[PDB]
Each structure stands twice: as structure tokens, then as C-alpha cells.
Amino acid sequence: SRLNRESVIDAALELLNETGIDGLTTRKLAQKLGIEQPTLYWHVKNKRALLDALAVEILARHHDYSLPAAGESWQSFLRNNAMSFRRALLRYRDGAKVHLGTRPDEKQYDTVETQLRFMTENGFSLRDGLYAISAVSHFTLGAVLEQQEHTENLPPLLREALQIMDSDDGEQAFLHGLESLIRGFEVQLTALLQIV
Amino acid sequence: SRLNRESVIDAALELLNETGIDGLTTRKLAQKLGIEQPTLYWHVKNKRALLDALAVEILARHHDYSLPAAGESWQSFLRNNAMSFRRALLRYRDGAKVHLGTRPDEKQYDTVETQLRFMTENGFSLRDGLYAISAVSHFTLGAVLEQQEHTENLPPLLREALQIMDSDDGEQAFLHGLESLIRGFEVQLTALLQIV
Ligand SMILES: C[NH+](C)c1cc(NC(=O)CNC(C)(C)C)c(O)c2c1C[C@H]1C[C@H]3[C@H]([NH+](C)C)C(O)=C(C(N)=O)C(=O)[C@@]3(O)C(O)=C1C2=O
Ligand SMILES: C[NH+](C)c1cc(NC(=O)CNC(C)(C)C)c(O)c2c1C[C@H]1C[C@H]3[C@H]([NH+](C)C)C(O)=C(C(N)=O)C(=O)[C@@]3(O)C(O)=C1C2=O
Numbered sequence: 001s002r003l004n005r006e007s008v009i010d011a012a013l014e015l016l017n018e019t020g021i022d023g024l025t026t027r028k029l030a031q032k033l034g035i036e037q038p039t040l041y042w043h044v045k046n047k048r049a050l051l052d053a054l055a056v057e058i059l060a061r062h063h064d065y066s067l068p069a070a071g072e073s074w075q076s077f078l079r080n081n082a083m084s085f086r087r088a089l090l091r092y093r094d095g096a097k098v099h100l101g102t103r104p105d106e107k108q109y110d111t112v113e114t115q116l117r118f119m120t121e122n123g124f125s126l127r128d129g130l131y132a133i134s135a136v137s138h139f140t141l142g143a144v145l146e147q148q149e150h151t152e153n154l155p156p157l158l159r160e161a162l163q164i165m166d167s168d169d170g171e172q173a174f175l176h177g178l179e180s181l182i183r184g185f186e187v188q189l190t191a192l193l194q195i196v
Numbered sequence: 197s198r199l200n201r202e203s204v205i206d207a208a209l210e211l212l213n214e215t216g217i218d219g220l221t222t223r224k225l226a227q228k229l230g231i232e233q234p235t236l237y238w239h240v241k242n243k244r245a246l247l248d249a250l251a252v253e254i255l256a257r258h259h260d261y262s263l264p265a266a267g268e269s270w271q272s273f274l275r276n277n278a279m280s281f282r283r284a285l286l287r288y289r290d291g292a293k294v295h296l297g298t299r300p301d302e303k304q305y306d307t308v309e310t311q312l313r314f315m316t317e318n319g320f321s322l323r324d325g326l327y328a329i330s331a332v333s334h335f336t337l338g339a340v341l342e343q344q345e346h347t348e349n350l351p352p353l354l355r356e357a358l359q360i361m362d363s364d365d366g367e368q369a370f371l372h373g374l375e376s377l378i379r380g381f382e383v384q385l386t387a388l389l390q391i392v
């Protein structure tokens with residue numbers, strides 16, 4: 001088959017869905033493409049290069065709330081940003097593991113920049129704007145990993161608690177924790193210089 | 197060398213430090229122990245069994261703020277709990293990756309139970325107590341992973357922001373985000389049934 005960038009990524013994503021992060025090899029990406037390993041090599045050097053590209057390409061393709069709508073509150077943006085971040089990570093088996101520890105690619109530099117600008121304009125110190133943006137990211141990743149990573153006679157609450165986590169996606173926990181985070185930030189922002 | 201449970205774990209942890217999660221194999225745990233692979237097999241079946249045991253054993257050994265002091269506020273406990281959770285994850289290379297997606301072992305059942313009890317007694321609905329405990333966990337894991345997982349000409353804020361994240365551990369971001377979370381929970385709790 002065709003070996004341009006896009007069709008390579010297509011084949012990788014489809015294969016990531018079949019095997020998970022661990023099972024994904026260059027050797028298997030070749031087979032899937034019906035080519036020899038040395039041919040693939042011209043196109044992709046190794047597993048690391050592939051993952052970095054997938055990590056970038058998954059957000060580019062399916063993370064569509066990178067930016068705030070015209071006139072959106074900062075609270076609302078973060079919320080939408082986080083929900084869309086989450087959906088994109090979950091769209092692929094081990095997708096969060098694929099994303100873990102990637103650096104903002106040159107190609108989203110102006111995105112991550114706009115986010116920080118947007119916070120600074122909303123009354124955030126650059127420090128605080130960055131802390132809120134990281135906390136959202138770290139919270140969302142962490143909740144997606146544990147969702148995906150999961151996939152002796154229980155004391156009472158533990159039994160019960162496990163039923164409510166299983167009863168849905170993990171979506172309630174996530175959306176509840178997200179509101180906690182944003183309110184916490186809000187309380188901090190508005191306090192300014194007061195003891196809070 | 198000696199092949200009891202504790203000395204096996206000792207050798208695994210030391211080896212996890214040498215290679216990271218990916219590089220850790222049974223074959224190498226044998227060598228390190230100066231034994232043959234089939235001997236090791238009697239003691240440990242495979243990589244999964246080893247990781248589950250390490251994951252449990254790292255918290256047991258070095259997570260010493262499992263429980264609240266007598267009369268501690270819930271805010272204070274969560275904070276201490278989270279700092280101690282974090283330290284324990286960071287004490288080992290890829291330690292957070294080792295912990296990811298583990299289920300509370302039978303041997304900490306009464307710990308995780310006490311935590312939930314302790315929240316319920318502090319005015320939390322079982323649902324809410326669980327949401328706060330997960331959000332803390334997910335936030336802390338996520339911040340530790342990205343710390344550990346990290347380890348084209350930058351626009352201005354992005355450049356600056358990256359310097360402040362690098363200037364320390366990631367400890368400021370973490371401790372700042374943690375306070376946001378706890379205040380957010382606090383605001384929710386105290387509101388009860390009011391629109392909040
Ligand atoms: C805060 N900025 C400067 C930043 C810094 C780091 N990395 C580090 O701090 C790494 N730590 C070092 C400095 C290497 C020791 C970061 O790793 C990140 C980011 C930006 C976030 C932004 C994320 C964002 N959402 C979830 C808040 C988002 O929607 C996008 C996007 N493209 O639309 C992201 O890129 C984002 O999800 C993301 O992954 C970020 C970072 O990776
Ligand atoms: C909330 N409880 C019932 C719970 C549930 C899950 N797992 C899931 O929800 C998995 N999702 C399913 C239900 C399989 C789809 C959980 O995965 C966890 C826990 C408990 C936390 C407690 C953590 C705690 N700190 C960080 C808040 C802690 O200090 C300890 C400890 N031993 O001292 C923990 O065990 C803890 O860190 C931890 O890892 C938890 C869970 O793993």
C-alpha cells in the first residue's frame with residue numbers, strides 16, 4: 001500500500017487498536033502495510049519516532065477544543081478543553097500511554113501558546129496560568145491512564161465504591177473532580193493578595 | 197543468593213532502578229540473583245506477577261501517610277496523603293508506571309477502607325468521598341508520570357513556562373494544583389444542597 005505520512009499513521013493507529021502500545025512493532029507495521037522492514041525504515045526509523053508522531057497526530061485529528069470560543073470564560077474553556085482532551089486520549093487503546101511524556105510538537109506550539117496568553121489575559125499570572133493548565137492536563141491523563149490501564153473478599157465501603165466506579169466510564173468521577181479543580185483555581189485567582 | 201519474598205523484591209527494585217520498567221525482565225532478575233531462569237520460576241511466574249508485587253510493596257515500604265493522625269482535618273489528611281503518595285512513586289525509576297492500573301491488594305484493603313470511612317465521617321457522601329479520593333490519586337499519578345516520562349524555536353510564553361517547570365522538580369506545580377483541588381472539594385462539601 002501507499003506509504004505517505006498520512007497512510008503510515010492510518011496503519012499505525014489501526015494497529016495500535018489491535019495490539020496496544022506494547023504489542024505495536026515496526027515489524028508488524030510493515031506486515032500490515034504489506035512491505036518489507038527495510039522499506040518501512042526509509043519512512044520511519046523506530047518505535048519512538050512513530051509514537052511521537054501518533055501522539056501529535058491523535059490530538060491534531062480528534063482534539064478539536066484546543067482553543068476558546070470568542071468570549072468564553074476561562075472556567076468554561078478549561079472544562080471544554082479537558083473533556084475534549086479526554087475523549088481524544090480514549091479514542092485509541094493505550095492512547096494515554098502513547099501521549100505520556102510527549103513534548104508540545106513544533107506544530108502545536110502556537111496552540112499551547114494561545115492557551116497561556118488566554119489565561120494571562122483573564123487575570124492569571126503566567127505562573128498561575130501554567131499551574132492551572134498543568135493541573136488540568138495531569139488530572140485528565142491520570143484519570144484516562146487508570147481507566148485504560150485497568151482494562152480477596154471486600155470490606156463494605158470498598159465493595160460499594162468499586163461498584164460506582166464500574167457503573168460508568170469513570171466519567172462521573174472525572175467530571176466531578178474537574179469542577180473541584182476549576183473552582184479551586186477560581187477561588188485562588190479572585191483572592192489576589194488576600195490571605196485565602 | 198537468598199530467594200525469600202523480601203530478597204526477591206529487593207533485587208527487583210534494585211534492578212528496576214537500573215533498567216526502568218521496560219528493561220526489567222525475569223531473565224535479568226535471575227542473572228542479578230545468580231540463579232537460573234527455571235529456579236526463579238518457582239518463586240515468580242512472570243513480569244506481571246512481579247510488578248503487582250512491587251506496586252504493593254513500594255507503598256507498603258515507603259508510603260507512610262496511609263492514615264490520618266488522630267483528629268486531623270480532612271483537608272490536611274488529603275494533603276499529607278498526596279505528598280507521601282507522590283514521594284513513594286518517585287522513589288523508583290518508572291515507579292508510577294509500575295503503580296499504574298494496579299488494584300488495591302488484599303493487604304491494603306483495610307487501608308483504602310479506613311480512608312473512605314474517614315471521609316464519610318467528615319461530612320462526605322460515599323460518592324463524594326470517593327470522587328475526592330480518586331481525583332487526588334489521578335492528579336498525583338498524572339503529575340508523577342509526566343515528570344518521569346519526560347526523563348524548533350519557542351514562542352515567548354511557551355519558552356518562559358518551560359523554564360519554570362524545569363527550574364524545580366515539578367513540586368511547585370504539584371503543590372499548587374493540590375490546594376486548588378482540596379479547596380474545590382471544600383467549597384462543594386460546605387454548599388450541601390445550595391446551588392453552588
Ligand atoms: C504548560 N505547557 C507549557 C506545557 C508544558 C509541558 N511540559 C513540561 O512541563 C515537561 N516538564 C519539563 C519542563 C520537561 C521538565 C507539557 O508537557 C505540556 C504543556 C502544555 C499542555 C497543554 C495541553 C492542553 N490542555 C489539556 C490543557 C491542550 O489542549 C493541548 C493541545 N494541543 O490542544 C496540549 O498540547 C496539552 O494537552 C498538552 O499535552 C500539554 C503539554 O504536554
Ligand atoms: C477509591 N478506591 C476504592 C479505589 C478505587 C480504585 N480503582 C478503580 O476505580 C478501578 N476502576 C474500575 C472499578 C476497575 C473500573 C483504585 O485503583 C484505587 C482506590 C483507592 C485509592 C487510594 C489511594 C490512596 N491515596 C493516594 C488517596 C492511598 O494512600 C493508598 C494507600 N495504600 O495508602 C492507595 O492505595 C491509593 O494510592 C490507591 O492507589 C488507590 C487505588 O488504586
Ligand SMILES: [Cl-]
Binds near residue numbers: 001
Ligand atoms: Cl494502495
Ligand SMILES: [Cl-]
Binds near residue numbers: 001002003004
Ligand atoms: Cl508510497
Ligand SMILES: [Cl-]
Binds near residue numbers: 004005006007
Ligand atoms: Cl501526507
Ligand SMILES: [Cl-]
Binds near residue numbers: 197198
Ligand atoms: Cl546469600
Ligand SMILES: [Cl-]
Binds near residue numbers: 197198199200
Ligand atoms: Cl532461598
Ligand SMILES: [Cl-]
Binds near residue numbers: 200201202203
Ligand atoms: Cl519474607
Ligand SMILES: [Mg+2]
Binds near residue numbers: 099137
Ligand atoms: Mg501533553
Ligand SMILES: [Mg+2]
Binds near residue numbers: 333
Ligand atoms: Mg492506585
